[PDB]
């Protein structure tokens, strides 16, 4: 029953709420696992766990009713925390062109793997993370950092193919 | 790898449209029709979905859910469908009335009781009665459009309903 695979995870991460009105959960634990599981049961949290952090150096988990796109909360640098965030409440549809999609698809139409932004391989490019902050252009995620028309795409691992738009539907459109 | 789907028993999804790609193999069970759906090796579209045949033991995974236009939904007492959760609008339009998503936690924490339970509360909202409206599970759910959005019957005895936590699309 090791759930953590299931969220979406930021390394050197945690987050901090500006309005102290926002409530927390903590305990000290044993493993980011253990931090996983009751996240995704919701065991013993007065609220709906959308995210957690597991603090390696302090061995605690923090769960959060909130995550890092939640108003009134910003991330932190830490060497020592990774930041899980429960899929549930990352929006999974686009909308208008895509450009402020955040969720983990990482396919694209026609079935291939996405490239990592981070690589050159296949495919050389100026699409670094460092140049399009705010964009998220991590691991292999679809996305459309410049807004274009076509919706989030990737580079593509088939050497083949250099780019591919992805498949995610609209959130609304009629 | 299960479990990142939501499951509908006895249901299968038929295509009208017969330009939407298919692929099917015959397998030993579900678990393995997830497994290549979730890593998506050997299909040439993204798998959004797929259906076990459990008298052919067969998997056919699709390219669509039942949200999809040009796909109609049907009973099949051996068909079970899966359909990925990242397809499933997780967001909320409106007050939530077409929310078909698993979250099945309120607002406060606390479990949703089933809706096909009369524990702790009794309650008039069973599954047939609202057919269309996915009463199924313990899923937060707003059939009839009720101001707070999706909600449930609670686990707690103490807290007859009350609204889940699920965002507004327009939210972010």
């Known amino acids: 029953r090791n759930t953590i695979h299931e969220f979406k995870k930021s390394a050197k991460t ?3 709420k500006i309005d102290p009105a926002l409530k927390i959960k903590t305990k000290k634990v044993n493993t980011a696992d253990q931090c996983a599981n009751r996240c995704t049961r919701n065991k013993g949290l007065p609220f709906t766990c959308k995210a957690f952090v597991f603090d390696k150096a302090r061995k605690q988990c923090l769960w959060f009713p909130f995550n890092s796109m939640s108003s009134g909360v910003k991330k932190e640098f830490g060497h020592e925390f990774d ?7 990352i929006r999974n549809c686009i909308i ?8 983990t698809v990482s396919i694209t139409k026609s079935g ?13 490019h100026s699409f670094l993370p460092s140049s399009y902050r705010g964009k998220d252009l991590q691991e292999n995620y679809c996305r459309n950092p410049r807004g274009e028309e076509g919706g989030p795409w990737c580079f593509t691992s ?5 780019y591919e738009v992805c498949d995610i539907p609209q959130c609304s459109e009629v």
């Open 96 to 103: 208008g062109k895509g450009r402020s999609y955040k969720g």
């Open 158 to 162: 088939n050497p083949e193919v250099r």
């Open 83 to 89: 930041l899980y965030e429960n899929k549930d409440y």
């Open 14 to 16: 945690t987050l901090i």
């Open 112 to 124: 291939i793997k996405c490239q990592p932004w981070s690589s050159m391989i296949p495919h050389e």
